[PDB]
């Protein structure tokens, strides 16, 4: 995340970290005691999920780790176009909820009018560093028309744009699959955006979570 700052320790109980071979790969979102949402392009064999973490560089008493036992990538995910960039991960046992581990409610209404949101993650910062402490930034949803003008021919109904014209606050590499949070609901997942990261000119593009209500619940119910 670029042009943000450290989050408060208790403000992100739904944030997951996805690890592969001992290093951060992606973010993710606890949406149910058994299930983490992330971006489909984060798919890899034998991922580990960390919940309840704040600082990646130390062992934390609140943290909980689990192997992914089942990965369910959206069947219509199209990597060439970034369309339908969403994946469900089943944990090995239900997360034990606490002050620092809580599932985030999904946005069920694609017409929800809250446009004031925030993003968070352990991804690259403005000077190229990868932070140990999770970062946070407030940003706003961008209209679909402005979104499509930024990326002509690329924005589908399954994508949502958000950014910050004043400072360029934006997600960046390492943030994929983390949450776009609006009104205490999951509105999007970090997916793709401008190179270099920064939203002053072109906003970040997020998987439009409200479109996946029924796929998510169907997958969770076996």
């Amino acid at each position: 995340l670029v042009h943000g700052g450290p989050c408060d320790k208790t403000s992100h109980p739904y944030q997951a970290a996805l690890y592969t071979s001992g290093h951060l790969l992606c973010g993710g979102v606890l949406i149910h005691p058994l299930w983490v949402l992330t971006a489909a392009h984060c798919k890899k064999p034998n991922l580990q999920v960390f919940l309840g973490k704040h600082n990646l560089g130390q062992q934390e008493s609140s943290q909980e780790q689990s192997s992914v036992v089942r990965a369910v990538i959206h069947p219509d995910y199209d990597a060439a176009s970034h369309d339908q960039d969403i994946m469900l991960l089943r944990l090995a046992r239900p997360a034990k909820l606490s002050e620092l581990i809580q599932p985030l409610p999904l946005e069920r209404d694609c017409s929800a009018q809250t446009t004031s949101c925030h993003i968070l993650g352990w991804g690259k910062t403005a000077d190229g560093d990868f932070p140990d402490t999770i970062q946070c930034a407030y940003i706003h949803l961008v209209s679909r028309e402005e979104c499509e003008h930024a990326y002509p021919g690329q924005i589908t109904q399954n994508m949502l744009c958000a950014g910050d014209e004043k400072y360029g606050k934006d997600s960046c590499q390492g943030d994929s699959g983390g949450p776009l949070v609006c009104g205490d609901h999951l509105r999007g997942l970090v997916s793709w955006g401008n190179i270099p990261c920064g939203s002053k000119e072109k906003p970040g593009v997020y998987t439009n979570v409200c479109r996946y209500t029924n796929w998510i619940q169907k997958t969770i119910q076996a």
Binding site: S21, H23, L24, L25, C26, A39, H41, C42, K44, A79, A80, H82, G123, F130, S171, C172, Q173, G174, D175, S176, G177, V190, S191, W192, G193, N194, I195, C197
Partner: protein, 54 residues
């Protein structure tokens, strides 16, 4: 030539360990790929990168 291209993360926001041939170094080196797009100077392993660009 593919082996002279700059290492490109691409526009997706993952942190995937990959390898690219570095021309001045004369060998392959790690970089973090974003998960989509980029270019062909991007290999799963150091050996396969060196097998193609070495």
């Amino acid at each position: 030539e593919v082996c002279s291209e700059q290492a490109e993360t691409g526009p997706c926001r993952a942190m995937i360990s990959r390898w690219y041939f570095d021309v001045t170094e004369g060998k392959c080196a790690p970089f973090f790929y974003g998960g989509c797009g980029g270019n062909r100077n991007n290999f799963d392993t150091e050996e396969y990168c060196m097998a193609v660009c070495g």
